[PDB]
Symmetry: C3
Subunit: 73 residues, 3 copies
């Protein structure tokens, strides 16, 4: 199981890596939006997805914390 | 195995969470492109990667559906 | 184990799919930044996160290579 636990641990870790990646690109999308916005429904679509994506990140963060707990058991 | 199935199920779920996150940031990138585009090769690079990324999302969506089936077995 | 190895292999694969997705959206964020930039601290925040995100992609790429090796064992 030790080697078994190893792979799953690097999968769980890799998922955390990906999530932080996704969060970091969010910070960047927000900036590009700000930039664009310094220069209609477009603003509406932006908010609909921004909310959606902040929603999905939260869920993932939560699921990440549970997967790491079930792995530590 | 029940607890074993549990972790893998939250990993599979987390992967779905990440994919939808990635898709939602795509909707947002498309919008920022539109925004930018309301104001050369740049347009070419945009299309090359847009296609690439829609390609990768499709594959992932497919692989997500298979991982969820192999887990339900 | 064969079926056991199967799921984990599609999870590892799915993670690669997601990473390449994330990298492809990076190429696109860079382009939208360039676009925006053709037209203050904003430039600083851009670099801080760009670095951060290139950092996270590297780590993930490395972790992807290890997970695929531990799975091939």
């Amino acid at each position: 199981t030790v080697q078994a636990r190893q792979l799953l641990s690097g999968i769980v870790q890799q998922q955390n890596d990906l999530l932080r990646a996704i969060e970091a690109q969010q910070h960047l999308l927000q900036l590009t939006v700000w930039g664009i916005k310094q220069l209609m429904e477009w603003d509406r679509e932006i908010n609909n997805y921004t909310s959606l994506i902040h929603s999905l990140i939260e869920k993932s963060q939560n699921q990440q914390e549970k997967n790491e707990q079930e792995l530590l058991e």
